[PDB]
Amino acid sequence: KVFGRCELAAAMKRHGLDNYRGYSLGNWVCAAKFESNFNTQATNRNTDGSTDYGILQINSRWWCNDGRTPGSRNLCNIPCSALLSSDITASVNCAKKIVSDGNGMNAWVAWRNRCKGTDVQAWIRGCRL
Ligand code: NA
């Protein structure tokens, strides 16, 4: 599923991401824009053999099982395919664990490089929230 900007903002707010660990909803929408272009089915293979999955490009090295990332963990206790669903529940629940990990949203390269320090509220501007 490819979400609209305001459609994703509404879904993330319903699932409790607005101000989760102090990160405003615009931070999460900005991260999803630059990680996946709002596409739940996005996948990207990394140099280390791990893969990034879904709207927030969550990595198989630590967070999910994809059956082909040797010596990796599954800290969200999910198959990586769960992160590709039209329903963002699994991605949101796993993102909450990731952002609690120590480096906050710096865990998302696209957030650090393209969202951090910018007018992230622009990403929810005009939305009926
Ligand atoms: Na894994």
| Residue 12, token pair as written in the block | 């993330």
| Residue 26, token pair as written in the block | 């615009």
Number of domains in the chain: 1
Which has the closest alpha carbon to 91: 41, 56, 51? 56
Give me ligand 1 centre to Cα 71, in Å: 8
* Owning domain of residue 101: 1-129
Annotated binding site: 101
Sheet with strand 58-59: strands edge to edge:
43-45, 51-53, 58-59
| 7, 12, 59 from 31: Cα distances, Å | 15, 12, 15
Active-site amino acid positions: 35, 52
Return d(Cα 127, Cα 110) in angstroms, integer: 23
Give me ligand 1 centre to Cα 9, in Å: 28
| Residue 68, token pair as written in the block | 């082909």
Query: 5-14 and 25-36 are packed helices; what angle lies between their axes, rounded to 10 degrees?
Result: 130
Annotated binding site for substrate: 101
Give me ligand 1 centre to Cα 116, in Å: 27
Return d(Cα 20, Cα 26) in angstroms, integer: 11
Q: What is the resolution of this structure in A?
A: 1.3
Cross-strand partners of 58: 53
